[PDB]
Amino acid sequence: MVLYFIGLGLYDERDITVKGLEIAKKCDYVFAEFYTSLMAGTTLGRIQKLIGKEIRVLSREDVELNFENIVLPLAKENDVAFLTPGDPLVATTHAELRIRAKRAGVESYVIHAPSIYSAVGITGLHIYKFGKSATVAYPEGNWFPTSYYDVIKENAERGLHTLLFLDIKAEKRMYMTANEAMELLLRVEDMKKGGVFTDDTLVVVLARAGSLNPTIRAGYVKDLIREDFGDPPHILIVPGKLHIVEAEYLVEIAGAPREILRVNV
Amino acid sequence: MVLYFIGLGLYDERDITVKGLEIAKKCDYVFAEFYTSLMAGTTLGRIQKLIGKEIRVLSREDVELNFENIVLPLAKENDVAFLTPGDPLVATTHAELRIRAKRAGVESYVIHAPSIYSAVGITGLHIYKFGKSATVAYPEGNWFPTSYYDVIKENAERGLHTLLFLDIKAEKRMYMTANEAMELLLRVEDMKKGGVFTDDTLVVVLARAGSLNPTIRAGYVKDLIREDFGDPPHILIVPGKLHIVEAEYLVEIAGAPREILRVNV
Numbered sequence A, B: 001m002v003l004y005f006i007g008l009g010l011y012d013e014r015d016i017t018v019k020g021l022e023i024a025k026k027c028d029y030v031f032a033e034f035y036t037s038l039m040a041g042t043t044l045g046r047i048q049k050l051i052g053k054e055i056r057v058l059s060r061e062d063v064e065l066n067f068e069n070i071v072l073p074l075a076k077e078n079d080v081a082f083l084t085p086g087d088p089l090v091a092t093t094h095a096e097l098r099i100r101a102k103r104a105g106v107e108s109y110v111i112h113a114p115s116i117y118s119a120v121g122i123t124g125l126h127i128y129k130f131g132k133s134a135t136v137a138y139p140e141g142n143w144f145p146t147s148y149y150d151v152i153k154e155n156a157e158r159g160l161h162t163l164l165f166l167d168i169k170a171e172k173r174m175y176m177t178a179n180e181a182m183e184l185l186l187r188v189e190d191m192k193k194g195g196v197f198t199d200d201t202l203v204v205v206l207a208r209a210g211s212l213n214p215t216i217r218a219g220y221v222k223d224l225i226r227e228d229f230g231d232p233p234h235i236l237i238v239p240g241k242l243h244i245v246e247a248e249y250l251v252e253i254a255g256a257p258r259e260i261l262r263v264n265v
């Protein structure tokens, strides 16, 4: 008699909230997708073990095309759950699935979970200072995406930071790295030459948020473009004008160039 | 030798992640702060009983002035947990505390949890479209702060949504309602006449996020300004131009008027 959208969190199976676990343990059927993001700290088995239910995984197509044929039909006579990495409604199009649920006469509920969108708080950058966000997508064929480049520009002009979700092709097991994302951004700089992303632009990389030992680094592109930030997933951030306290955290915690301390007011 | 920054999540004692609960249980000492925000759906006692540990509450002064004298000493020789509502380090002042830990030769780890900053995804508004964030503060005495008005203006100007955290007098335990916030914004409009917030402005109200039954309502100020959204906490959102999918969700799930489909898209 219900459908639950339950978030699994940032890194491993324990990133689920107690609410989400207690509820998932009591559902009759459990579905999940693992294409919107990457949980590099667990495995399907451990999750199934933690929840104590068989977890039927779905592909982007099963979801996007047959959600109402695969999941909804059961939600009518049973308690069904749909799991996702991080928060189920952040940087996905899952929200519209609630509309399908409604249109099918199924009540739906949402259980949140830690999201990279808020997790960036660990970088020491003020969350309220983040502007519009964007995704650095893989180029395909002769199509060259540049929108994400303009987002950075627009925010930087207001002194705001930019959060850059990195692309992903789960079926191919391809998880864009920050290094890759930086390369792509430099290329776009050649094209537009708007002085947005150069070798002297300060950036911050967060890898494996949620793990006890995430990788947090801040520095100039020229020096990080070649750095190894560990296994994915990675997120890239282009800070705006920094508050002194932010710079302090970047230098003290993310080992950034001690020079960023002398901010330009 | 270890300090754990553990987030308590959105609303009640079950909004902590399994990771945060287990880690908290294995800690020798447990501290908590409830001045950046509160956990409206639970009590200190319900949290203590869930953690199975005595929890010492610290004031703003305790943390901001004597964190190194109250919390860190015990960390140098034990496993200490510092709990906070939401997701740690989303609150501006938190990050600075990791530096203090370092200064004392103490290791600190962060255990994330759902933040309202990311939970707003349940409103159907695309997360990437959220711009700079602001807080609607209660005017007091000869001080009438209004920057939050300019934040809406700059965001909406760029087609971006604006998340407004509503003021909370933690000690006094008073919550600013969305209605109160709307009234304030209508007054700030009469003073700046910038056409940023009026009776015809479309807004979204999210109450008790995290709860299984939050209140998600969308509509024009003139219709919502005196509507009862239930118990706190309330979050107010002034969306920018809407993508049709966002609008369809607001109408179908948040009871928004069909009118927004042609006026705000």
Ligand SMILES: Nc1ncnc2c1ncn2[C@@H]1O[C@H](CSCC[C@H](N)C(=O)O)[C@@H](O)[C@H]1O
Residues within 6 Å of the ligand: A010, A011, A036, A037, A038, A085, A086, A087, A088, A089, A090, A091, A092, A114, A115, A116, A117, A164, A165, A166, A167, A168, A206, A207, A208, A209, A210, A211, A233, A234, A235, A236
């Ligand atoms: N633990 C983590 N560390 C760093 N980046 C992460 C991450 N989890 C997700 N991301 C980033 O976000 C992208 C997925 S976008 C979907 C986000 C998800 N709903 C959430 O709430 O987090 C990834 O490609 C990656 O760039």
